[PDB]
Amino acid sequence: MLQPKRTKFRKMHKGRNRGLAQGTDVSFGSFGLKAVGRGRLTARQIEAARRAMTRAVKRQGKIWIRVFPDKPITEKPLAVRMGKGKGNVEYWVALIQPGKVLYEMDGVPEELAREAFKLAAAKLPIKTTFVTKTVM
């Protein structure tokens, strides 16, 4: 899940990010979810939170991702012994900032915000907030 395909590179810097980005705006749907916290988000976290939200809408529509990691992180045991270069890929990671949209939807439920997005959202490393398309 959440992997880029046939990449030119795989070794990349971890480094640091300013954590501010840009003001919330939706693109693919009429409704979305904002992060409200800052830091990093893993592919296993994005899928675990998606797996809870798709049941919060039961079987309605499709929920579109607005975070896709495209950055791989490697892990290697201290049994080779060590110092013999980076190992295989273990997780894929994305950047999060308080205004960042995580997911978007338009085919939304009729009990929206009594279930899904405002409520029944789970497995997330931070608390989130529900957001609209806006006309002004």
Partner: protein, 94 residues
Amino acid sequence: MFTINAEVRKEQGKGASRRLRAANKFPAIIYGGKEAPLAIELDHDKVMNMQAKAEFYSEVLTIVVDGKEIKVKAQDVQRHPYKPKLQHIDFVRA
């Protein structure tokens, strides 16, 4: 037809802007109309409660500043990156 009172700003730029953003007021401007660009300070939450109706952004409104009554129309806005709150707004003379 809204009517609001404003003051002409005493100081400008990042440091004065962050000094003006102290939860009581926020910055705005009035420009065009063959007259000078006027830098003003507006109430942070009373104007927020007034712009809750689309006529603020769609119909002519009145600003009183320096005891002088200006007729204006809405042009552009800036808001907080994860909150609905006003950071800076543009008006043009009607």
